[PDB]
Amino acid sequence: HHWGYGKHNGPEHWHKDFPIAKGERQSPVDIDTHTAKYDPSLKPLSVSYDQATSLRILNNGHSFQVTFDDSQDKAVLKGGPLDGTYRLLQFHFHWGSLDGQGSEHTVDKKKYAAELHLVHWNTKYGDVGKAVQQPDGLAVLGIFLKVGSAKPGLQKVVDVLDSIKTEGKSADFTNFDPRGLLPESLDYWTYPGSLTTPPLAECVTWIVLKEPISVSSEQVLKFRKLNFNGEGEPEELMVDNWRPAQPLKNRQIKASFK
């Protein structure tokens, strides 16, 4: 039926409705750290999030997402491997049922407990709908989560999750500052890829940060209490909403760091 992460509608099925699932530049991938190429022509990332305006938090039945006002250049990503200015639209997470799985990207086959995606779109295309049709339309910042110490800047998000437990619930979520989710270092790997959910469009420049952030077990536990289902349907916990690594095919992963 409609796609998801279950036995009968999960990632191994998606190609029937979205044939680009078997394409040449699909995501995520395993990052082989010994095969990644240091590229000294890569610039530092510029993350300018001081003027970010968050709007809403929403359970969309496959993750939860925080949406931002992208009507002007408030929260932007520039530099790195990018040409031009990319506006922050939303962030969302992927996570597991257990601490040893949950990330989409892996590093030398290592899985992390979760993965944070900050999705940005190239302002030269005027709106995000147009941007997803272009090979350089989106830039997604990927950040790994490991279980350890708590991340204080994540707590405002975990404390509102009980109010968006089921599919289609949303809530006002203003004045959230996404800088509190970033690691110390902005060293990164980058490669051309795709959205990791349908429609799996091959429009993404991936920027995956080397340094994970730490979250506590109590914080990740709250993610795992969300539901895939709508209110009044049989309860199905929202866990393991990650798509496995795809073949690299004819691509090179570049590193910003030696």
Contact residues for Zn ion, defined by CB under 5 A: 117
Q: Report the C-alpha gap between 200 and 195 in whole angstroms.
A: 5
Q: Which amino acid, one-letter code, is at 190?
A: T
Closest CA to 114 of 235, 221, 205: 221
Nearer residue to Zn ion within complex by CB, 104 or 136: 104
Cα–Cα distance between 223 and 36 in angstroms, integer?
Answer: 32
The DSSP-derived string for 151-194 is -GGGHHHHTTGGGG-STT-EEE--S--GGGG--S---EEEEEE-
Q: Which CB sits closer to Zn ion, 207 or 234? A: 207
Active site residue 2: no
Query: Per the annotation, does 94 bind a ligand?
Result: yes
Residue 117 known to bind ligand: yes
CB of 94 to Zn ion, least distance (A): 6
- Measured from each CB, the residue nearest to Zn ion is 117
Nearest approach in angstroms of CB 40 to Zn ion is 29
Q: From CA 41, how far away is CA 77, in angstroms rounded?
A: 18
Catalytic residue among 13, 34, 62, 105: 62
Closest C-alpha to 142, from 77, 223, 98: 77
Burial profile 47-83: b = 16 or more Cβ within 10 angstroms, e = fewer: bbbeebebbebbbebbbbbbbbebeeebbbbbbbbbe
Q: Tell whether residue 196 is among the known ligand binding residues.
A: yes
Smallest distance, Å, CB 92 to Zn ion?
Answer: 6
In whole angstroms, the minimum distance from the beta carbon of 206 to Zn ion comes to: 11
Amino acid at 229: N
Nearer to Zn ion, 88 or 152 (CB): 88
Complex with Zn ion: residue 197 or 219, whichever CB lies closer: 197
Catalytic positions, written as ranges: 62
Which residues fall in the annotated binding site for Zn(2+)? 92, 94, 117
Which residues fall in the annotated binding site? 92, 94, 117, 196-197
